[PDB]
Amino acid sequence: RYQECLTFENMAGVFMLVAGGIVAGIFLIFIEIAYKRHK
Amino acid sequence: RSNGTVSPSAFLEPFSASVWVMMFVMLLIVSAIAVFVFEYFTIGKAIWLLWGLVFNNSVPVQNPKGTTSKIMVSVWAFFAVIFLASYTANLAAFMIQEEFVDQVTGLSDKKFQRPHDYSPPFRFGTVPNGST
């Protein structure tokens, strides 16, 4: 009679999508700063 | 039992674990990195923004700098409201389920040795010259 026996995957997917969006935003900020330095 | 017995599970929220904690840490790190990037006092304002648009913007933490700051704030707010919606849905789903497992789970577990010693004298209404 012995018995041996928020989602992280949701959290992981949200973290991955947020990281991608943040990387895109940082690249956009860098490009905009470079253009503004020339304009 | 006298009336309805259920498990409130007040502390059983998915918090206090390592599931959403890692996501929260990653999101906070990303937000701080983006704030530093857009920076091109500040620490206190950044902490205020991190604590604010995570729970709720119902506090004076307004301090934008540039368009990229607005874009990152929009993305972080979208993530935060998605998290709030997910938590509301999860708690409602828990409300859908229920827990009424057991109360004693044993014919001699603790009380059935000396009910007076346990304090409540549970009734022993057997039958004369019966079977049990």
Side-chain angles (χ1 to χ4, degrees), chain A residues 1-2 5 12-13 19-21 24-25 34, chain B residues 1 3-4 8 10 14 17 32 34 42 44 46 49-50 52-53 60 64 66 69-70 72 77 80-81 84-85 87-94 96 103-107 109-112 115 120-122 124-132:
Chain A
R1 187 61 273 170
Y2 71 94
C5 179
Chain B
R1 88 287 176 281
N3 41 44
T42 49
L49 287 175
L50 189 136
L53 282 72
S69 298
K70 184 248 292 183
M72 201 45 257
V81 301
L84 277 169
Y87 263 50
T88 50
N90 279 126
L91 183 63
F94 151 77
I96 289 300
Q103 299 301 116
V104 168
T105 315
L107 272 176
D109 194 287
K110 171 59 209 69
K111 306 94 177 174
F112 315 101
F122 302 101
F124 272 18
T126 186
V127 286
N129 48 65
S131 301
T132 64

